[PDB]
């Protein structure tokens, strides 16, 4: 576990409908939710792959399970039953535990993705903004919609605003 989901970002956003992970801004021009489509898509592809891996790796052959034995063949009847029952116990246990294990991992995978995305942003801004926590960053400068969209697509210009931020930071 990575400490983000249900953690230092304590809740989810029902209002963010266009993806799994994203942002919510607020400047003079307005405010709103917007998914990060690259990292959301990236995850969908990988989860999809997981689901398909679990399903499509199963080798299925044609077989007629049932057998019929006469009243003087109890022993091979019971041999047969042992086989059917042995396979039932194996598949049941593996299937049950596979799912339990993969679900722990899937959930953690998402936690990781959200954490990596917080860090991605933190390391762009640095001291040009304050880490409130709960996943928010509070700017020391005027961040207009172009500025926002730049952080979201990873092309934020630290230099541009670094001096405007410094003077504001001290008060």
């Amino acid at each position: 576990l990575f400490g983000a989901i249900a953690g230092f970002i304590e809740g989810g956003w029902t209002g963010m409908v266009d993806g799994w992970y994203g942002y919510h801004h607020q400047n003079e021009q307005g405010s709103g939710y917007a998914a990060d489509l690259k990292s959301t898509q990236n995850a969908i592809d990988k989860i999809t792959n997981k689901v398909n891996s679990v399903i499509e790796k199963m080798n299925t052959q044609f077989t007629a399970v049932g057998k019929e034995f006469n009243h003087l063949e109890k022993r091979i009847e019971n041999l047969n039953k042992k086989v059917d029952d042995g396979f039932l116990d194996i598949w049941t246990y593996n299937a049950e535990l596979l799912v339990l294990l993969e679900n722990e991992r899937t959930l953690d995978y998402h936690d990781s993705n959200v954490k990596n995305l917080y860090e991605k942003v933190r390391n762009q801004l640095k001291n040009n903004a304050k880490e409130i926590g709960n996943g928010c960053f509070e700017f020391y400068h005027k961040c207009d919609n172009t500025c926002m969209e730049s952080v979201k697509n990873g092309t934020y210009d630290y230099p541009k605003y670094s001096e405007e931020a410094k003077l504001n930071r001290e008060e």
Binding site: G12, H25, A35, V51, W91, H110, G135, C136, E138
Partner: protein
């Protein structure tokens, strides 16, 4: 002042899943891995219909018990189906030898043609092919017998040595069944076959068995103190089968030229048969899925999901739903 927050999705959803660390965890999206629904119908497996015996069992069917002629016999089938009231079988009591192996071998065939190996009118000029009928196998209220066998009995006061061969020119193997009759008493033996102390002999290239009647009173079954045992063999292409007898032989009339398929099975259920395709059949009904597990029934036929004891196998795709 301006802010930018990082966060994650939440929604409507009430889907839960289990993990190793935690149960009943609510998630945004989820997918099911366990098929638990079946269509309540016995369908056509890989496009080809099963053989539905209904009133009879396999024994009754292949012998031609009189109650089974209202069935119509297809020329191929994917699996066999009996019902729990499939009680019409060997109407004259006795032992059906290697019966279970017979049912396994007929479970699926890609080709099946019934044909008159020893035509009634022409094959038995020195024996009586018309008498030889019993209250144990009644037809239209009157005494009858199996359709695919003839019970040869003496002509006048004479049962001369009987001798008959069949060469398999059918290019597939042919299943030949016959029977042998064990009378109640030496009086009965002599009534039917004239000579007491008889033998029947049957042979192919790989089979050879001599049979002697065992004359005694058994407990009455369908009013018979006598008995009749049913035998069968598969004559391979090119090979022949020969019968030799001084009495007590229930000779074949019809035989079956067949091509066996490959381990299918017989399902016993009263679930109705329908026109539908499937790749996986259970006695409760058919399964339409690509999910790797199922909990409907352990005894399946086809390319089936693995039967498990689980009630729920739900796999998280989305994330923890927190609002």
């Amino acid at each position: 002042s301006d802010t930018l927050c990082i966060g994650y999705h939440a929604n409507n959803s009430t889907d839960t899943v289990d993990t190793v660390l935690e149960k009943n965890v609510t998630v945004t999206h989820s997918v099911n891995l366990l098929e638990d629904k079946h269509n309540g119908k016995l369908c056509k497996l890989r496009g080809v219909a099963p053989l539905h015996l209904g009133k009879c069992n396999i024994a009754g069917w292949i012998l031609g018990n009189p109650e089974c002629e209202s069935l119509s016999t297809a020329s191929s089938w994917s699996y066999i189906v009996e019902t729990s009231s499939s009680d019409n079988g060997t109407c004259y009591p006795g032992d059906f030898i290697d019966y279970e192996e017979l049912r396994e071998q007929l479970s699926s065939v890609s080709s099946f043609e019934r044909f008159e190996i020893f035509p009634k009118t022409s094959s038995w000029p020195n024996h009586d092919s018309n008498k030889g009928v019993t209250a144990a196998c009644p037809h239209a209220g009157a005494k009858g017998f199996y359709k695919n066998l003839i019970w040869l009995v003496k002509k006048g006061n004479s049962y001369p040595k009987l001798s008959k061969s069949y060469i398999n020119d059918k290019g597939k193997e042919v299943l030949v069944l016959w029977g042998i009759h064990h009378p109640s008493t030496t009086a009965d033996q002599q009534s039917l076959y004239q000579n007491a102390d008889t033998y029947v002999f049957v042979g192919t290239s790989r089979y050879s068995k001599k049979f002697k009647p065992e004359i005694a009173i058994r407990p009455k079954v369908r009013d018979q103190e006598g008995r009749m045992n049913y035998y069968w063999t598969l004559v391979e292409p090119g090979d022949k089968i020969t019968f030799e007898a001084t009495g007590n032989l229930v000779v074949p009339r019809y035989a079956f030229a067949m091509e066996r398929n490959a381990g299918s099975g017989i399902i016993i259920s009263d679930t109705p048969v329908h026109d539908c395709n499937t790749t996986c059949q259970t006695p409760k009904g058919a399964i339409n899925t690509s999910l790797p597990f199922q909990n409907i029934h352990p005894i399946t036929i086809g390319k089936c999901p693995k039967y498990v004891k689980s009630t729920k196998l739900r796999l998280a795709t989305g994330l923890r739903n927190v609002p």
